[PDB]
């Protein structure tokens, strides 16, 4: 058993009120009052982030932790926050965004955020069975939280195998992907294998809630995987009993309009 396993069991034990006080204490959080309202309407003229995923990818890019260039692929785009972020970047030539949709899953929000015309959105697609194609940048933000850590580990292992197939198709491609449950032994093993072949390492986003152990793997970064995960596990374990609340920051506004 690991520190992250204990955190998970610790987190499941929380009452509602303690879950609400724990999940956001000490985290950065975009103020989405306006963006939520634009989404609640049908507002198609919108450059504000369509989700909290946009700021996370921007945090990674702006730290030098993630490279976005050329033909981008967003695997599991949901509303498309990463897709719109990537499409706004001058180095990016095109985004091919895929998400499964269906009952209880988000579909792309259709909006005029800068560079939107460069995005090819495609719902009803299972990226785990899709054939990989050419890509310069491989993004994948897949990983649905679940009280059962074995399930989180299995979902995370499917993502890493997804990235192995896309990297086998595009060996020189950069990649950034969500690792929902990095503390699981099957996941540590798969990341270790991935790191031996493709390089990279794991980093923690300050926008991630304490309710999730998610870390992001990127080929732009380095580091001992086991140490990275334990460092995060210890921090999350510490945060219990603390309740200073989040630090609010403005949401990203990418502007609107087309790109060439």
Ligand X SMILES: C[S@@+](CC[C@H](N)C(=O)[O-])C[C@H]1O[C@@H](n2cnc3c(N)ncnc32)[C@H](O)[C@@H]1O
In this structure, what are the phi and psi dihedrals at residue 54, rounded to the nearest 5 degrees? -60, -50
Q: Which of 5, 11, 48, 76 binds ligand X (CB under 6 A)?
A: 76
Q: Determine, following the binding rule CB under 6 A, whether residue 78 of this chain makes contact with ligand X.
A: yes
Task: Kindly state the helix (H) or strand (E) to which residue 21 belongs, with its residue range.
Answer: helix 16-23
Pairing of strands 174-179, 215-218: antiparallel
Ramachandran sector of residue 101 (left: φ over 0; alpha: ψ -120 to 50; beta: rest):
left
**Judged by CB under 6 A, which stretch of 123-131, 210-218, 227-235, 249-257 contacts ligand X?**
123-131
Nearer to ligand X, 105 or 234 (CB): 105
Minimum gap (Å) between residue 126 Cβ and ligand X = 5
CB of 146 to ligand X, least distance (A): 12
Closest approach, Cβ 137 to ligand X, in A, equals: 14
* Number of residues this chain uses to bind ligand X (CB under 6 A): 21
For ligand X, the binding residue among 8, 79, 157, 213 (CB under 6 A) is: 79
Residue 55 φ then ψ, to 5°: -65, -30
Window 95-114: residues binding ligand X (CB under 6 A): 98-100, 105-106
Kindly state the smallest distance separating residue 159's Cβ from ligand X, in Å. 9
Beta strands in the chain (DSSP E): 28-31, 70-75, 92-99, 119-123, 137-140, 174-179, 201-203, 215-218, 247-250
Q: Write the CA distances from 244 to 21, 31, 50, 52, 211, integer angstroms.
A: 8, 17, 27, 21, 15
Q: Classify 119 as helix, strand or coil.
A: strand
CB-side neighbour CA atoms (13 Å) of 116: 21
CA distance 1 to 16: 26
Residue nearer to ligand X on the CB measure, 81 or 115: 81
Query: Judged by CB under 6 A, which of 19, 128, 198, 240 binds ligand X?
Result: 128
132 in contact with ligand X (CB under 6 A):
no
Told to check if 81 binds ligand X by CB under 6 A, we report: yes
Q: What are phi and psi of 138, to 5 degrees?
A: -110, 115
Considering the complex, state which of residue 21 and residue 77 has its C-beta at the smaller distance from ligand X: 77
Query: Given the rule CB under 6 A, which of 5-13, 30-38, 73-81, 181-189 is the region that contacts ligand X?
Result: 73-81
Rounded to the nearest whole angstrom, what is the least distance from the CB of residue 229 to ligand X in the complex?
20
Complex with ligand X: residue 31 or 126, whichever CB lies closer = 126
Residues 12-31, interacting with ligand X (CB under 6 A) = none
Nearest to 52 by CA among 71, 65, 39: 39
| CB-nearer residue toward ligand X: 142 or 187 | 142
> Under the rule (CB under 6 A), what is the footprint of ligand X?
51, 53-54, 76-82, 98-100, 105-106, 125-128, 141-142
């Amino acid at each position: 058993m690991t520190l992250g396993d204990l955190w998970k069991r610790k987190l499941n034990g929380c009452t509602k009120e303690e879950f609400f006080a724990y999940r956001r204490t000490g985290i950065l959080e975009t103020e989405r009052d306006k963006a939520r309202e634009l989404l609640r309407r049908g507002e198609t003229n919108m450059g504000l982030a369509v989700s909290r995923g946009t700021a996370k990818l921007a945090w990674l890019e702006e730290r030098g932790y993630a490279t976005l260039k050329g033909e981008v692929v967003d695997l599991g785009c949901g509303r498309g926050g990463w897709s719109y972020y990537a499409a706004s970047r001058p180095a990016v030539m095109s985004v091919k965004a895929y998400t499964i949709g269906g009952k209880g899953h988000e579909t792309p929000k259709m909006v005029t955020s800068l560079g939107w015309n460069l995005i090819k959105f495609r719902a009803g697609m299972d990226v785990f069975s899709m054939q990989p194609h050419r890509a310069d940048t491989i993004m994948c933000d897949i990983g649905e939280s679940n009280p059962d850590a074995v399930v989180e580990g299995e979902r995370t292992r499917k993502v890493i195998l997804l990235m192995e197939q896309w990297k086998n198709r595009n060996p020189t491609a950069t990649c950034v992907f969500k690792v929902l449950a990095p503390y699981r032994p099957e996941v540590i093993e798969a990341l270790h294998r991935f790191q031996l072949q493709w390089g990279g390492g794991l980093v923690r986003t300050p926008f991630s809630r304490n309710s999730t152990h998610e870390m992001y793997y990127s080929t732009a970064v380095t580091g001992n995987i086991v140490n990275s995960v334990n460092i995060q596990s210890r921090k999350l374990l510490a945060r219990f009993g603390d309740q200073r609340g989040p630090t609010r920051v403005p949401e990203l506004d990418l502007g609107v309009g087309t790109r060439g």
